[PDB]
Amino acid sequence: LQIFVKTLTGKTITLEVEPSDTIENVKAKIQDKEXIPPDQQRLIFAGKQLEDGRTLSDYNIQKESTLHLVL
Ligand SMILES: [Cl-]
Ligand SMILES: [Cl-]
């Protein structure tokens, strides 16, 4: 699955994931790309706050979905 993550400046991160990856796994991928610590990352998809222990499939996140990093 390819997904996009937008940083707080609008920078686009492109990630390769599996549909059952957890949000904790996605945060580690964001950390490797950008230096952002997982405990400062808050991710939103379609106005839903994503929880670390849940999976992308739990949120119906699909090919080319865009997640946002937020305060
Ligand atoms: Cl997985
Ligand atoms: Cl895993």
Side-chain angles (χ1 to χ4, degrees):
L1 200 193
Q2 190 169 77
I3 61 172
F4 305 104
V5 179
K6 276 159 190 298
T7 77
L8 272 161
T9 63
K11 189 181 185 314
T12 297
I13 306 162
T14 306
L15 303 179
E16 190 66 28
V17 299
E18 292 189 271
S20 299
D21 264 309
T22 58
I23 301 309
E24 200 71 68
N25 289 353
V26 169
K27 283 188 176 190
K29 290 171 177 281
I30 294 170
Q31 181 186 28
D32 291 342
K33 288 279 193 178
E34 296 300 322
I36 307 164
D39 78 18
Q40 303 298 116
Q41 299 178 34
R42 185 164 168 238
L43 287 159
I44 307 306
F45 169 65
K48 304 183 292 197
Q49 194 176 146
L50 308 187
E51 292 179 352
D52 303 48
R54 288 282 171 272
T55 68
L56 299 170
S57 52
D58 283 330
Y59 296 108
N60 196 224
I61 290 163
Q62 60 187 35
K63 64 180 182 80
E64 304 218 317
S65 291
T66 297
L67 314 195
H68 289 268
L69 284 162
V70 294
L71 303 172

